[PDB]
Design a protein around this ligand. Sequence first.
Ligand code: FAD
Length: 498
Amino acid sequence: GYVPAVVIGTGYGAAVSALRLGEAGVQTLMLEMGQLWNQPGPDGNIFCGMLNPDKRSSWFKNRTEAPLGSFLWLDVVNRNIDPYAGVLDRVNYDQMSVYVGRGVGGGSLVNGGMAVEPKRSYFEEILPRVDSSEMYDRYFPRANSMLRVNHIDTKWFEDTEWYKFARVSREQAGKAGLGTVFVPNVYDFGYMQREAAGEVPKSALATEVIYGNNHGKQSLDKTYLAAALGTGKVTIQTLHQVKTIRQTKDGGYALTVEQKDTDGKLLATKEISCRYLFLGAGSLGSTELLVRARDTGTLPNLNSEVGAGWGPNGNIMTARANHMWNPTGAHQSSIPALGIDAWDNSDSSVFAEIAPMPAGLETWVSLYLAITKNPQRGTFVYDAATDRAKLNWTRDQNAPAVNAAKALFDRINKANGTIYRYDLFGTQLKAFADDFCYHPLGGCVLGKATDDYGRVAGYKNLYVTDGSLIPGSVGVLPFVTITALAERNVERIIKQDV
Ligand SMILES: Cc1cc2nc3c(=O)[nH]c(=O)nc-3n(C[C@H](O)[C@H](O)[C@H](O)COP(=O)(O)OP(=O)(O)OC[C@H]3O[C@@H](n4cnc5c(N)ncnc54)[C@H](O)[C@@H]3O)c2cc1C
C-alpha cells in the first residue's frame, strides 16, 4: 500500500527525518530490515554481552567473533550459532570489512555512544557549500540536546577503577606532548556511577556495548524514535528490507520490500508506495539501493556520482604494550571516555579513541581507534550478476591512514620506551588493523550525488539522509554530524518541498 512518506532504515538520518516529518503532520512509515530489540532472550536480557556472545550478536553468521583487538582473550568464548537476525553485521567486501548495526535504531544499538562535534574549520573544509554558521549555531546544539548527550563526572572518572585504562593512556600520551579530551556520550554517566556502586544492573560495567547495552545507553529507540512514535504520525515495520526503488509514472515512488522472519525465511514480498521517499539505510545500504536502481534501470537518471566518494573515516586500530608498572586494569568500562586530540587538519592529523578492552583480566594492553585524514576514496560498483553493490577499496588505499596513526603512536612509544603489540589482529605480525571500518562515510555525497540538502540529483521528492552524504571523513566520531546534518536537511525539505 501507499503512505505519504516512507523512510528506509531507522538509524540517525532516518530517525531525525521521521521525527520532523511526524511533527509536521506527515504520515510516515519506517522500514527496518532488522529487529525491534525488546524481547528478553534465553538469559533474560535483550542483548548478549561480549563475554557471552550468542546468535543475537551476529547478523546471519554461523559463528560468533571476538571484538576487534580482543581475539587473544575472547576467542575462548566464541561458539557456533544458527544464522539469525542479530544486532551486529560484519559486511565483508574484497579488502574491507564494514561493521554496521541492524535493528530499530541502527548503529545506535551497537556503537560506543561517543557524541563529538567536528572541528568547525574541518567541517568548512569538507563541506564548503554548507553554511557552517547555521550548523554550529542551530543544528549541532539541536542534535546534542535531542540525542541526550551528557558528560562524565571528572572526580568520579579520576577515582574509579573502571577508567584506569583511560588514565594510563592519558599519562603516556602526555609524555609525548599530546593532549586528551573528555568525549561526551549518550550513555547515562549518572547511571554508570550507580553501576559501579552496585546500585543498578550493570551494562557498560558488565562488558556490554558492541552487541547492545541492556541498560544505560540512550540509543535512538529511546530518543528520536520514541519521540517520532509519540507524534502519532509514524509507524515502524521491522524485518522489512527494501530491495528496489522505482518512480511511478506520476512522480511518486514504489518499493519492493521483503518481509522475513528472524531465521531469514521469506514470508512475503510487498509493494509499498509513497510521495516522499527518504533513504536512511546508512552509507552501505542507501548507496546500494541507489547504485542498484541506476544500473538496473529503475532510477535511470541518477548521476555518476552515486556510488562514489566512500571512505572509512580514516579508521585504524592499534595497540601498545604497557610497562608492568602501568596496568590498565581487569575492570574497564565498555564506554570510552577519553580521546587523544592530535587533529590540526593537516595530513598528520589523528583523533584517537582510547578504547577499553573486554578481557576481564590484566593484559597491559592499551587499545586505540585512530581517526585519520586520508584522501583515498572507494566506489561502490553494482554487480548485476549477484545483485550486490561491491566496494572497490583496496588495503593499499589505507596506507596514508596507517602512516598517520603510526607517526602519532611512534611519538608515544618513543617518549615512554614502549613497543606495539603485533599479535592482536591475526597470526602475522601486524600492529595496525587497516581493513575494517566502524564509521563508513560516503557513497551518496552531499552536493555530488545530491543537492546541498540531500535531494537526489535527477529526481524530485527523493532524499538521502544518512552517513552516505558525508565525504568520507569528519575527523571525529560521526553520529553527531550525521544527526545535525539530518536536522538541517529535513527542516529545509519540509519547508520547501512538503
Ligand atoms: C562498533 C561500532 C562503534 C561505533 N562507535 C561510535 C561512537 O561511539 N560514536 C559515533 O559517533 N559513531 C560510532 N559508530 C558509528 C555510528 O554508529 C554510525 O556512523 C551511524 O550509526 C551511522 O548512521 P546512519 O544513519 O548513516 O546509519 P545506520 O545507523 O547504520 O542505520 C541504517 C539502518 O538502516 C537499516 N537498513 C539498511 N539497509 C536497509 C534496507 N535496504 N531496508 C531496510 N532497512 C535497511 C539498517 O539495518 C540500520 O538499522 C560506531 C559504529 C560501530 C559499528
